[PDB]
Amino acid sequence: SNMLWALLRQYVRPYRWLLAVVAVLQVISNMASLYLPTVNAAIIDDGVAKGDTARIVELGAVMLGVTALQVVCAVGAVFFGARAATGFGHDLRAAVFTHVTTFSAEEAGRFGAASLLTRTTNDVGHIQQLVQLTVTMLITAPIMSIGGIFMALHQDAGLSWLLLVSVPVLGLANYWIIRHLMPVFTRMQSLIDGINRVLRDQLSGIRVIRAFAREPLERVRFAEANQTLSDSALEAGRWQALMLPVTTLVINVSSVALIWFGGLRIDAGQMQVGSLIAFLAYFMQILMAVLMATFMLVIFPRAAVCADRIGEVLSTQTAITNPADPVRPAAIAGDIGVHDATFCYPGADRPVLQDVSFTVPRGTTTAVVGSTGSGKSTLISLICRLYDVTSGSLRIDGVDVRDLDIEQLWSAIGLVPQRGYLFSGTVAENLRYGRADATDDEMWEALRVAAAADFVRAHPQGLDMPVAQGGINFSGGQRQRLAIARAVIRRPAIYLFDDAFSALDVHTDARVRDALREVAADATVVIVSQRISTVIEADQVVVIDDGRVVGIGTHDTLLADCPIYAEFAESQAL
Amino acid sequence: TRDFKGSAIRLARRLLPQRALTLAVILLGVGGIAIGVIGPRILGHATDLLFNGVIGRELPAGLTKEQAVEAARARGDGTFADLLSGMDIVPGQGVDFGAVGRTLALALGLYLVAALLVWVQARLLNVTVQRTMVALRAEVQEKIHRLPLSYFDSRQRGEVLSRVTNDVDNIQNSVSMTISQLLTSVLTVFAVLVMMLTISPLLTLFTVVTVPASLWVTRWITRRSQPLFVAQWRNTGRLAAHLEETYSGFTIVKTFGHREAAAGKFAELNSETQQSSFGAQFFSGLVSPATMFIGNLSYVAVAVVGGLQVATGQITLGSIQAFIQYVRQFNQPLTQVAGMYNTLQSGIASAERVFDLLDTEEESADSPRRADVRTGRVEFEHVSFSYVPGTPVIEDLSLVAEPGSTVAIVGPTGAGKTTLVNLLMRFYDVDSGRITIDGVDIASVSRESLRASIGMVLQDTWLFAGTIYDNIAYGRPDADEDEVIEAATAAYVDRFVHTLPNGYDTRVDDDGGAISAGEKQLITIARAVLARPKLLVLDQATSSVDTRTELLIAHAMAELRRDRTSFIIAHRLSTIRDADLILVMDSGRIIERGTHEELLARHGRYWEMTRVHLGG
Ligand SMILES: Nc1ncnc2c1ncn2[C@@H]1O[C@H](COP(=O)(O)OP(=O)(O)OP(=O)(O)O)[C@@H](O)[C@H]1O
Ligand SMILES: Nc1ncnc2c1ncn2[C@@H]1O[C@H](COP(=O)(O)OP(=O)(O)OP(=O)(O)O)[C@@H](O)[C@H]1O
Ligand SMILES: [Mg+2]
Ligand SMILES: [Mg+2]
């Protein structure tokens, strides 16, 4: 629970004065609640014993004032507690999001796009719940216990030994129960985590599960996880079921000892009768508050693990930032250098790109050809500066991508990745990610360029046709054409087609390429493709094998001098 | 919109089934509550005995109670005699500590019995709560496995995930956190009311005035707070949706310069959800102080009136002490219910969402017949299908596939090839017509066996978080190590696995890992081929795989492709060449079909498609 304290200390400091106001108001309210029985004892002693009804009425008015103070201070504490809890939760969420948005591809891949979502909302909620339950109930038990001890000492110090001995017994019993419960609760949380991951995997790959008839194995796995979770929860509940009886028993035994010892003191003229009522109410308030506070302690292990996850997210430091003072060329539209680039993924034993050196002149088309796992997508990601070169330099427009701020470099680059993603909403909304200010006319022009205008015009809603979460309401080629249209609507200086024509038929692929050549004539294009038929039109073709460039030149020189490209052409020949 | 009362009563019915264990739970709770409520009367009797002895000790022993009363009347202020009138002392006796000890021993025994009964009832409640939760989780998982694909395609993954896991966990927390409190409160209120009615009707009426007023205040607060709760839930859902869409497509958002817009939208949603949560939480927490205030007003009235009666002599002091204890033990359950109202409402909302998911329409009545392919011949007969009915995607389609024939499907980008092979796997219900494999309608056989008989390479590759060996063995986990190694070698997964320093043990994920798109497709191919399917479907199975590796893979799988009726979908004509039958479909209808030689001889769409390679 080291990370819990750090997170609370960091993100509750702006609300520390509201917390102090909550604390003082709760103290006042609990003091009023424990002082009402003192006024009852005063009625019993200075009233019916003396025979003064006027004193009884006066003390009733005093009790009315005490109750008014109690309700006012309770409402005032609830309001500020809610304020502080919601503020802490909102600030923690806004900090986690702001940290995650600075992550790189590798940093985000460390946790995943779903773990970050579950840590941004449900991990902050489980700590704001602790905040609220501490400013509402967990603070009541110490306040009520110490205040009741003081009030019992005030009423009659002779019988304060009871109230000072009974409370430690309850404290030790509840401490034993907590010490035997907390490991079980940690196990229950760590085991419900697994049954949640199982259900997430079952829903993310439902089509693959159905296609392979993996329903019975999924059922068996879920049944085993459910049974183990139920065993852990039953073991926790067996201990948790002792909390209320072991507190009520202490209250009742304390009350019986009260009636005995107070009676013994009363026979000696050392105690008034109303003190018995006062002490009885003190017991049934002090110990009931402790019981209520302790019964709720299902949060601390859960909050501890949630805070551990949040702190591990917030401790991750990015590796690709604007260096100190980025160079800002006007309208970057130049060439790509790639001089002796050497890249090795973090945690990898061997580099994936070795001694890569090829230049792409501005306004030309360069096709990257290689085997599976050769490093074409890695090179494309290097151009986008999603990853930083371990050695060498890239030199886009004659200047390193490292010293260029990555907002203008990305504004000058229109990238359609191999693993594309279409956001849920409308086709117009998805295309707006390219421009965000595009009119309907240029949106339709971008759709027409990417051959995506027909299947959007077909829908009765036109540009407002719905899009599923991952575009699963479209075909794969339709998703690729939508991504191409999104890249086109940007009108970027550099196009990076990372296998953007894999799911397009020959006719549609040729039409899209012709429209692009008509539109992107003045723009640099780097296209990663498998078909040789699409690479003759490229001015320069680069072949990479094992991660290193094995051939540079046009189609004819590569077919004549590079054995790998000759093998590719021979394999694809009809 | 959303019915919370019905979901609450359904959840209560699930929690407390027919009288097998819930009857014992209720009986134990009632017995313990009655035994523990009896005790304060005993304590009041002991206090009455102490006061009687103390008062009577001071009075002279030569006079009885009536003489003492008349002597006090002869004395001043009059009220002492009224106090003694209802006291029933024996003057000059003192306190009898033996009777006090007996009374307190009886109280201690009753309190011990009540504590034991409460413990047993709590254990039984825990057992039944866990049983109910197990049943709920099993039902949720079965419903997940029975839902149609349109249900998942029409919603975000995060929303369904939260409705499936987070809502169930919230329900579990709420029940195991509040069921015992609810039962104890509902029994204790009535037991205390009965014993207060036994003590004195006036003071118990004064105490019971609170319940109407407390209910009115609670109703007002709930009326003011329910819109806040629904707004908070809506706002949390919107925030979670925005977070999921930003995180899943982080590369696209970051690259296309939309990070600032996403940050601004998140800030707006965060502020709005903060406001909604603050309002809901404040109005939900306001219940307990109000109930405590009304209970304290009743306590003040009861104390004052009881003191007035005790001074007059109509009620003994021990009875009034018992009644004060009863007032406190009556006000406490209402305060506890008011305090836990927030958790109760959260659990009710979660149960509402879970029941909404569980009441969704399922696919269809699955046939119990086990699919059994004998030869492998596939036939389509006027198959018509359409997602979102009103726009056909496949209409008037008919095709025949010989048992050893390799059928290749080529066509435009939105023809319907994936829809066709999904209809073959019974992913979606065929609108009109039927599909027959070896003369039996696929709709008349179980989906499980039919989909197990066919090994399909999905167009969108998917891998679950685990080792590469686990992902390959996902097709058939019972296969031994040698079979998985052979499947990986045939698909040339082993070629790049040997390169990695943790071969077959490196952990890969759908969104990343130590893998590439081509290698991910290779692992999917190995997973498909491991299951030794009797029917082969390959939907753009090598779209991201180079042709040099494709040649080796084709040679390696030629043993399987000989006698398994492969369905090959590809936009590369080289892969689909030399297929026994080639289907060209344009807009969900097969415009032309035949082998390569006939297709070239008759010209048509295929000839134009293959002349693009030669240029024009
Ligand atoms: N939920 C859905 N899933 C898939 N297709 C859908 C869905 N709803 C509607 N459709 C429509 O179904 C049509 C049939 O396309 P299909 O999914 O069969 O792709 P395809 O012909 O295999 O394409 P490609 O060759 O690019 O893979 C598409 O035009 C698409 O708009
Ligand atoms: N985190 C990682 N992400 C991607 N590749 C990684 C990673 N770690 C290691 N690699 C290695 O990087 C190599 C090259 O991957 P990359 O995706 O760049 O290849 P590629 O030739 O572009 O792929 P494909 O032809 O399938 O599109 C792979 O062989 C893989 O083992
Ligand atoms: Mg790639
Ligand atoms: Mg498809």
Author numbering:
A (entry chain A): -1 to 572
B (entry chain B): 14 to 629
Task: Please share excerpts from the published article on this structure.
Here, we determine mycobacterial MsRv1273c/72c to be an isoniazid efflux pump and determine several structures by cryo-electron microscopy showing specific asymmetrical features including an N-terminal extending loop and a periplasmic helical hairpin only found in MsRv1272c. Thus, MsRv1273c should have a degenerate site impaired for ATPase activity while MsRv1272c has a functional consensus site with the classic enzymatic motifs. Confirmation that this is correct was achieved by mutating both E553Q and D497N, creating the double mutant, which has little activity. Together, these results indicate that the consensus site of MsRv1273c/72c is functional with normal ATPase activity while its degenerate site exhibits very low activity. Thus, MsRv1273c/72c is a drug efflux pump for isoniazid, but not ethambutol.
An approach to obtain the Occ state of ABC transporter is to inactivate the ATPase activity by making a glutamate to glutamine (EtoQ) mutation in the Walker B motif of NBD. Based on this, we purified the E553Q mutant which had a significantly diminished ATPase activity and then added ATP before data collection. We then solved the cryo-EM structure of E553Q mutant in the presence of ATP at 3.1 Å resolution, which showed an ATP-bound Occ state. In the Occ structure, the central cavity in the TM region is sealed at both the cytoplasmic and periplasmic sides. The N-terminal extending loop is squeezed out from the cavity. The two NBDs are fully closed and interact with each other in an antiparallel manner. ATP is clamped between the dimer interface at the consensus and degenerate NBSs. The binding mode of ATP is similar at both sites and is classical amongst the ABC transporter family. Taking ATP binding at the degenerate site for example, the α- and β-phosphate group of ATP binds in the groove formed by Walker A motif of MsRv1273c, while the γ-phosphate group is stabilized by Mg2+ and helix α6 of MsRv1272c. In the ATP-bound Occ structure, the NBDs are fully dimerized with distances of 6.8 Å and 6.1 Å at the two NBSs.
